[PDB]
Amino acid sequence: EQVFLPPFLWDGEQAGGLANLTSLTFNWVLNNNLARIWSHSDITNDVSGN
Amino acid sequence: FICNPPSAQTVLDRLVFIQVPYDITFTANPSHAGITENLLQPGRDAFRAFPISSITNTLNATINGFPVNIELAQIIHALSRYHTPLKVKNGWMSMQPSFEDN
Amino acid sequence: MSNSAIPLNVVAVQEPRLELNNERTWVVVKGGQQVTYYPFPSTSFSSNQFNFICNPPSAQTVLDRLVFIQVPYDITFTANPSHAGITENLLQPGRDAFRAFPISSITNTLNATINGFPVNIELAQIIHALSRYHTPLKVKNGWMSMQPSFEDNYQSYRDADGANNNPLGVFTSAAGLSELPRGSYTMNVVTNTTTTARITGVLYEQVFLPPFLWDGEQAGGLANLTSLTFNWVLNNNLARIWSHSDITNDVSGNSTIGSMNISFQQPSMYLGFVTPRLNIPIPPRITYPYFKLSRYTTQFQNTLAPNASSTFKSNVVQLDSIPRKLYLFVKQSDNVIYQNLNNQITTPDVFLQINNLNLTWNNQQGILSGASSQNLYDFSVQNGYNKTWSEFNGVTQQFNGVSGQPTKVIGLEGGIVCLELGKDVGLRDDEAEGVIGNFNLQVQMTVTNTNQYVTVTPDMYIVAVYDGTLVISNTSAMASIGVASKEEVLNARITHGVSYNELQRIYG
Amino acid sequence: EPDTVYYDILIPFKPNDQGFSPAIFQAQLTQPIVHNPSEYFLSVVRFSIPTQNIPLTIPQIQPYPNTNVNNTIYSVSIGYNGTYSSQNFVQFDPSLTSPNIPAPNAPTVTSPNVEVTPYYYIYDYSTFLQMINTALENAFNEISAPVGADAPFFFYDSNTEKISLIAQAAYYDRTLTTPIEIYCNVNLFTFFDSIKHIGLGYNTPTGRDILFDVRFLGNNYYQDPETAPSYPPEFIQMQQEYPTLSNWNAVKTIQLVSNLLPINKESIPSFRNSNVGIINAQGILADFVPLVTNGPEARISIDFVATGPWRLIDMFGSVPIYMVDLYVYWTDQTGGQYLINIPPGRILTCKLVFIKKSLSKY
Known part of the structure; x- marks a missing residue:
């Protein structure tokens, strides 16, 4: 997965990098649900439908 | 993650990303049964795009002790719709599942 | 504005919908009178090698850089014992086409001397590296539309059919305003059944090697040439032009097709001479950019399959000058696939996937050793790679939904890493992209094979490409690599003036 | 500002x-x-x-070989003469909780530890002690006699607020010459302590060490409460002094x-x-x-x-x-x-x- 927040960039154009850094650090907090990763078709249900 | 640049006056490139090995199991719901045919289907079920970003409540990074954060969950699916061209869509972006919901 | 940590300077712009004032001019567009064209037919073609020679009219007529060669042909296939089977028309709608690109794939080498100094490019394998690399959709769909030029994306034809992006299908079945598949290119069928088939047509292919160009924009065409002679030389095998799918052939490994022969009728080549206006004259002596591909190849004895990994060692080399660009794709070997045609016609044009690479430029080792395969793809795309991450490193989980078969895996395409030495490797100070000295590389690397079907013995590659300047004056052809000195290169007055990207274009 | x-x-x-x-x-x-x-x-x-x-508490399951997702890193013992009983562990049964959650899958070679599903949660003392009970009871029955005697049980007072241990009472008190005994997995111990316990050499191969001692030794007699009171009293009681909330x-x-x-x-x-x-x-x-x-x-x-x-x-x-x-x-x-x-x-x-x-x- 790409890190998506500027300054960092996701469009293929290239521009200067951030010198003169001392310490970068990230942090990812996951959204509670975790089912949301998957997708589905409403069709396969079918007809009840659970 | 927590990672300090290796050396003095070392410029840092601006494309950053993260790989994450996973494991998932699906279980059948004992109603409507059957229920014939394999749970996962051929052109029926695959990852949501883009997966990790969508299930991130928020991600934070602090460049050099000053904090910068974005809200990945809802911002994305709209920020993803443009300014994308085909050239770019096919490039860097492609790594993460990349197609929209038509 | 002077509100930042360091004061910065301001300017204003106007929104597109209103200037509404700024100085306008009228730009008349002057181009020499009398543009002409002519088919130069081949003085003494043959079946083995053919070759044209043409002389530009005089010292003052500027020939243009885009050249191509059209060649008429016929073929004929005949069903062999003892496969049959032997049912249905010997060709089938979804299964047959020319290889992209057809006569390029057969050329052993194309040599073309200019003004008396001979520059040549080997073409059988060097052409496929360069093929995926720099083109985008809008330029793929322009000039390079004349040769049947859609890249083979599966690891074997067998699986392809029938996907609506299958590499050799019929015109209908290919989506709207897209790259149309290989099968679509027209030639008439005089006959077709079981036991026999015969086709006739005329296939274009534009001569590839620089200076002559295949990408859309125009740079001043060579002048003032005095004389110019191409000549090809083809691989004896020749059976490679046609490509055929696997499914149709029956089990016991028996092949429907084998064997068949090709024919050519005298072919031609179209040059375009332009001559300048009365008052504007062209300088006595001029200077064009001069590129130069090379190929180094190393084969081994060991084999891996149907999906096991391996690591390998490229042979050591010594390089006269740091080259601009390099390509490092490992592909199914050439030793095999010229032996025994059905396989020779059948095999696709994909290479094995790169699990990672470790490289050593001079006196350092371990360059890129901790960079995950995914990283390579990003730099390669940045150079223009143009293919999606899914195919690079290709494999795909297409899953079955029937109780209770296992779920097919597909071998997909290949990966071909490229690095630019200034961009990517980093050259020690005092040294830069053009400079000369002796820098030895040796690229170890690990690879997995992916197609589920066959065992593969693999021969690695490295294409390098130096950048030089070549001066033409009639009739002379001085050419020099690295123009370019160590002290001058170091002093390097640097202009915050030109962009990088514009620089990117006049590739390559 | x-x-x-x-x-x-x-x-x-x-x-x-x-x-x-x-x-x-x-x-x-x-x-x-x-x-x-x-x-x-x-x-x-x-x-x-x-x-x-x-x-x-989230009670802990033994990390295998162990293919019943259920039985845990717990055990008990009885002694008489002294013939022992091989320890029966304790099986954390679902239907005393749930019963309506899916159970997980016990993990050969691969990873050996069962990951914790909300399925393992146990609220109360009322619900866990009632599990040791089904173990001691089931244990005892391998080594019968003499005559008639119920196996001991654990109960937790409300407002005591202390867990107890009840056992007869003219055998098997530890001052008699013929006493029956209790042992543990020395791991399960942490909850039960501090009952009065003679120590024995920590984690021995064959199960059994620590020895909950009945004999009083106390202002400790207890009775009933399911019949009219009788002299001498029905069973000895040994409530823990400390009261912990705790290790649990x-x-x-x-x-x-x-x-x-x-x-x-x-x-x-x-x-x-x-x-x-x-x-x-x-x-x-x-x-x-x-x-x-x-x-x-x-x-x-x-x-x-x-x-x-x-x-x-x-x-x-x-x-x-x-x-x-x-x-x-x-x-x-x-x-x-x-x-x-x-x-x-x-x-x-x-x-x-x-x-x-x-x-x-x-």
Whole structure:
């Protein structure tokens, strides 16, 4: 997965990098649900439908 | 993650990303049964795009002790719709599942 | 504005919908009178090698850089014992086409001397590296539309059919305003059944090697040439032009097709001479950019399959000058696939996937050793790679939904890493992209094979490409690599003036 | 710009269609709280959490070979003459809890430990002791006699508030020459102690060490309560003096974290051993261990009114703040996260403070 927040960039154009850094650090907090990763078709249900 | 640049006056490139090995199991719901045919289907079920970003409540990074954060969950699916061209869509972006919901 | 940590300077712009004032001019567009064209037919073609020679009219007529060669042909296939089977028309709608690109794939080498100094490019394998690399959709769909030029994306034809992006299908079945598949290119069928088939047509292919160009924009065409002679030389095998799918052939490994022969009728080549206006004259002596591909190849004895990994060692080399660009794709070997045609016609044009690479430029080792395969793809795309991450490193989980078969895996395409030495490797100070000295590389690397079907013995590659300047004056052809000195290169007055990207274009 | 501004964070209650609430709140605020947060020490008073929903304990399963997802790292013993009984472990049966959650899958070679599903949660003492009971009972029956005698059982008083151990009573008291005995897995021990216990050599191969001692030795006689009283009394009782709430708890910490406030990032400790190392960095706001002793009920609720002195965290960049983001978690060893859950009847409430750095520090 790409890190998506500027300054960092996701469009293929290239521009200067951030010198003169001392310490970068990230942090990812996951959204509670975790089912949301998957997708589905409403069709396969079918007809009840659970 | 927590990672300090290796050396003095070392410029840092601006494309950053993260790989994450996973494991998932699906279980059948004992109603409507059957229920014939394999749970996962051929052109029926695959990852949501883009997966990790969508299930991130928020991600934070602090460049050099000053904090910068974005809200990945809802911002994305709209920020993803443009300014994308085909050239770019096919490039860097492609790594993460990349197609929209038509 | 002077509100930042360091004061910065301001300017204003106007929104597109209103200037509404700024100085306008009228730009008349002057181009020499009398543009002409002519088919130069081949003085003494043959079946083995053919070759044209043409002389530009005089010292003052500027020939243009885009050249191509059209060649008429016929073929004929005949069903062999003892496969049959032997049912249905010997060709089938979804299964047959020319290889992209057809006569390029057969050329052993194309040599073309200019003004008396001979520059040549080997073409059988060097052409496929360069093929995926720099083109985008809008330029793929322009000039390079004349040769049947859609890249083979599966690891074997067998699986392809029938996907609506299958590499050799019929015109209908290919989506709207897209790259149309290989099968679509027209030639008439005089006959077709079981036991026999015969086709006739005329296939274009534009001569590839620089200076002559295949990408859309125009740079001043060579002048003032005095004389110019191409000549090809083809691989004896020749059976490679046609490509055929696997499914149709029956089990016991028996092949429907084998064997068949090709024919050519005298072919031609179209040059375009332009001559300048009365008052504007062209300088006595001029200077064009001069590129130069090379190929180094190393084969081994060991084999891996149907999906096991391996690591390998490229042979050591010594390089006269740091080259601009390099390509490092490992592909199914050439030793095999010229032996025994059905396989020779059948095999696709994909290479094995790169699990990672470790490289050593001079006196350092371990360059890129901790960079995950995914990283390579990003730099390669940045150079223009143009293919999606899914195919690079290709494999795909297409899953079955029937109780209770296992779920097919597909071998997909290949990966071909490229690095630019200034961009990517980093050259020690005092040294830069053009400079000369002796820098030895040796690229170890690990690879997995992916197609589920066959065992593969693999021969690695490295294409390098130096950048030089070549001066033409009639009739002379001085050419020099690295123009370019160590002290001058170091002093390097640097202009915050030109962009990088514009620089990117006049590739390559 | 003013010297100090307080803020209140409360989360209401939101169930899924499937009854569950995430104790997180997050909000974009329609107008900045601090004009410029470079000069504020942020600290928190008065935060409070409904704990009504947490297990009392997550009982531990033996990491294999062990293919019944069910039986645990627990055991008991009986002795007589003294013929022993091979220890029967204890089987944490679902239908005394649930019964309606899917059970997980016991893990050969691969990874050996069964991951914790909400399925393993046990609330009460009433529910766990009632499990040892079905074990001692089932144990005893391999070694009968003499004559008639019930195997012992554990019971927990309400307001005692102490667990007990009841056993006859003219045998098997330890002062008689023919006594029957109890042993354990020395692991299960931690809950039961402090009953009165003779020690025996820790973790011996063949089960059995530690020896709950009946004999009194006490103002200790007990009877009934299911018949009219009789002399001498029915059974000996040995309630633990200490009363613990305790070793029992699955709650080892709780942790509010907030991925928004400019803040500074302090590391939380792991439970990993190898290694330590490895400092991590994420913002950590306020967080406390269970304060012994707030006496049950503390199972009912945790609470932390600040009592002084101000404990400061820092703040960094110069972005006017637009979001209050806050997450609450409760951790168990082995140290897994488990984001806290808010019960149908209660509201979860923090408070906050910004102080202008200049007043506090030169």
